[PDB]
Design a protein around this nucleic acid. Structure first.
Lengths: 82, 98, 333, 93
DNA sequence: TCGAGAATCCCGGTGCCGAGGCCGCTCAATTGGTCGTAGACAGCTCTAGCACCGCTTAAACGCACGTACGCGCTGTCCCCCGCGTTTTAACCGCCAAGGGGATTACTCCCTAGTCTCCAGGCACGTGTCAGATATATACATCCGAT
DNA sequence: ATCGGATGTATATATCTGACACGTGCCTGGAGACTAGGGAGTAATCCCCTTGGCGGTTAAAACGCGGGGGACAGCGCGTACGTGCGTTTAAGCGGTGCTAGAGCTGTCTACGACCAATTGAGCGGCCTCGGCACCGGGATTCTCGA
């Protein structure tokens, strides 16, 4: 089960929904994929670092506390998950 | 005669209701599939908590709306209502993301 | 790139064995056999009152199998135009296909029922098996030599049977990448070699080599030789076909009435041909021994050839400036 | 597994400030995570300053100083006063 | 600009499960000795800071002035907003298997802690050249006439 | 687009030197050796969350489709800003001198450390029920053509 191309699984309607939440009126097309890239790049770090935790955790499943400590180490800490 | 609201107006109300709403704006399964696809790059066949991936998507979308927000702001400083990729790039640049 | 005014209601066409004649079906239900060299119609056959949606030449070229929309299949001698045999079924026929090495045999893909292989000598029929028993839409095709039958269902399942015993000689389900199936739109083979292609509902053409499926066995994971798509427009493919040699592949974007041309080995897009933006693309075929491509759109046929550097460019023609190589005795007597 | 939290004291101080109010358990967990965050913050800063002071004993002076380093303006002032009053009360007996 | 229409606000009613309250059931908090010790404190240095003051000068402030980017306005293109339609797969609900996560119980390898001794590190002198500085020079580059 | 002149800058040179590489004697942290405990590691067990699939829905995404709206390009002007040259000014060297306060040592002592004995504050688990979420419907208000 080898996955691929779920990045475009991000719908442009979803992107513009997030933008409207951010309070944006007019948007260009060139953004979305660009956006996506950033998205990827962003998560590009955390999961790895997260599984890095799981790396040292010696476990096969990945937990929330992983990304908790990541975002912490990434200076983007989050609440509500222990 | 058919009626059509002026441009932005509908999107304006969308902005208003989205600042009104708080839930996610991304379909769960596509995001999850994307996450697992990214995961197999570093190591294959890794499991996850639904809570974990919910956290991933929430935190992502938060970062994303923040990026959209300050890029909107920059575009204000760009005196345009349309967004330009360079706005996002330079925003990351100021965000130290370059 | 060249059309024909002499035929109307073009719906489906089929090259003969040597790419000399073209039998096109019309809405009136007539066969128009048009010739390439004389560039004129060679024959008109009153096939059906119902339009013809499936047409195939015999190996000797003396027989053509035609399928009406009235679920009426009929064999016709190309010299005479007589209805050699005629049969009718339920679940209207989607396709017919002569057996490439036995013109007596012909496979038929109906709409809702399983494909059945009949013979002309004896009016018998062999119903080919169905994996999931609930596909209701399975395309099927002989291989290049007619030794195996490739059947693809609406659920991405692919069965390779042997043409004589209908025994399952190979099997595998194609994926949409993640975990899902896709409706097998069509299965095509190469008239040369063993590479074949699959058009699927994912708008992604998958090129394989049948030997790899045979060695993959039943219920295996055979990878495609190539994956081909319009990454730019994500366009469906109404009809696709190989080149005559089998190293070029064309797809018909009926969404925008265009033609995409990729290679086989590399798979890079050779080119794109744009038709009338107002025409609805219907049928696509390649000349079996020529870089000529027949297209049927809005009942009109167009021809797309490909010529060499000559026909005016043949002194000794060169492309770029040539520095003269002076000799030792270049100035000597 | 015996897991420790503070949501009970959250409910307590809530009733102390708002008796007629409910909370989402989600919000309780968020607040508790916040408690943990501020606790680790102040503790690390105190240990670090004591290291700068080469002190192996973290006392209330360290507490107040580190809070002042962390909290801004009247937040810090009120917090300092409150901790002072509380340690005074405890030391009174 | 006064209506039409449309998205929204609010009201009542329905049904729910999380918020909460209470109940067994501890282990972690308290209490009380007891002990070695962190530092609190006193009491010395000394030195680095703190200010003083003079001398030289590179530097700073302001002027005048060209000028050229900022800004403001116009018209165009194209393009993204809005709406309509068609397709789909996220979701949701349910099921199921197992594989990992967490647990506990042993078991013991390794580290903390102690004591001994000394040798690498550190403060401290000590010549000494990398480079700082100044000068004349040769090369690069702008700015304006042609 | 070029040449000439102005000017600013990279270079070689000379010497001065003060950081700086280098070496010392002396100190103590590091090594070496020895003892204990017990954190860590392993293993068998349980659970149970996850990962997988299956079917129905539609809200949502895809895609198309004008089309007004602004991105943008250009174009005038003008004010504000570089600049080079004036001016005056504190900045820096430097060296002086006092000591307030760091910065060090030597106590001695209160103060957790720690352990042991005790337990009730708190936490997992179990009802429970009511704000809250959803829904439908009615009334309100923005907006786009007069």
């Amino acid at each position: 089960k080898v996955l691929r191309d779920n990045i475009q699984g991000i719908t442009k309607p979803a992107i513009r929904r997030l933008a409207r939440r951010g309070g944006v009126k007019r948007i260009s097309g060139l953004i979305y994929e660009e956006t996506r890239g950033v998205l990827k790049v962003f998560l590009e770090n955390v999961i790895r670092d997260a599984v890095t935790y799981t790396e040292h955790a010696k476990r096969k499943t990945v937990t929330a506390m992983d990304v908790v400590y990541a975002l912490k180490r990434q200076g983007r800490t989050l609440y509500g998950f222990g | 005669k058919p009626h059509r609201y002026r441009p932005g107006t509908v999107a304006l109300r969308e902005i208003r209701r989205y600042q009104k709403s708080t839930e996610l704006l991304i379909r769960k399964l596509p995001f999850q599939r994307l996450v697992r696809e990214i995961a197999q790059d570093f190591k294959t066949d890794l499991r996850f908590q639904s809570s974990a991936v919910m956290a991933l998507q929430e935190a992502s979308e938060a970062y994303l709306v923040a990026l959209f927000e300050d890029t909107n702001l920059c575009a204000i400083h760009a005196k345009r209502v349309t967004i330009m990729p360079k706005d996002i790039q330079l925003a990351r640049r100021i965000r130290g993301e370059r | 790139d060249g059309t024909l005014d002499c035929i109307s209601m073009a719906l489906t066409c089929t090259f003969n064995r040597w790419g000399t004649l073209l039998a096109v079906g019309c809405n009136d239900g007539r066969i128009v056999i048009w010739d390439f060299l004389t560039r004129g119609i060679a024959k008109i056959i009153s096939a059906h009152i119902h339009p013809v949606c499936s047409l195939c030449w015999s190996r000797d070229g003396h027989k053509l199998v035609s399928a009406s929309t009235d679920n009426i299949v009929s064999q016709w001698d190309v010299l005479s135009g007589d209805c050699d045999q005629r049969f009718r079924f339920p679940s209207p026929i989607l396709k017919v296909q002569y057996h490439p090495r036995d013109q007596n045999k012909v496979l038929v893909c109906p709409m809702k029922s399983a494909p059945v292989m009949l013979t002309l000598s004896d009016s018998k029929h062999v119903v080919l098996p169905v994996d999931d028993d609930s596909d209701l839409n399975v395309v099927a095709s002989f291989d290049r030599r007619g030794e195996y039958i490739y059947t693809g269902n609406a659920k991405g399942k692919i069965l390779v049977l042997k043409t004589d015993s209908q025994d399952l000689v190979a099997s595998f389900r194609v994926t949409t990448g993640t975990s899902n199936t896709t409706a097998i739109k069509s299965i095509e083979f190469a008239r040369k070699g063993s590479c074949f292609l699959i058009n699927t509902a994912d708008r992604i053409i998958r090129v394989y080599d049948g030997r790899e499926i045979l060695t993959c066995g039943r219920d295996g994971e055979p990878e495609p030789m190539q994956k081909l798509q319009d990454l730019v427009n994500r366009t469906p493919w109404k009809k696709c076909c190989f080149s005559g040699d089998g190293e070029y592949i064309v797809a018909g974007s009926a969404r925008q009435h265009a033609l995409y041309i990729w290679e086989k080995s590399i798979g890079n897009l050779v080119k794109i041909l744009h038709g009338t933006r107002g025409e609805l693309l219907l049928d696509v075929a390649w000349h079996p021994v020529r870089p000529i491509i027949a297209s049927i759109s809005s009942g009109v046929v167009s021809i797309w050839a490909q010529n060499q550097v000559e026909n005016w460019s043949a002194f000794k023609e060169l492309d770029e400036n040539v520095e003269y190589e002076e000799r030792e005795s270049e100035f000597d007597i | 597994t015996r897991k420790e939290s503070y949501a009970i004291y959250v409910y307590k101080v809530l009733k102390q400030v708002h008796p007629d109010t409910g909370i989402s358990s989600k919000a309780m967990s968020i607040m508790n995570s916040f408690v943990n965050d501020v606790f680790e913050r102040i503790a690390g800063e105190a240990s670090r300053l004591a290291h700068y002071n080469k002190r192996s004993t973290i006392t209330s002076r360290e507490i107040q100083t580190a809070v002042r380093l962390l909290l801004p303006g009247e937040l810090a002032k009120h917090a300092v006063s409150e901790g002072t009053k509380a340690v005074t009360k405890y030391t009174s007996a």
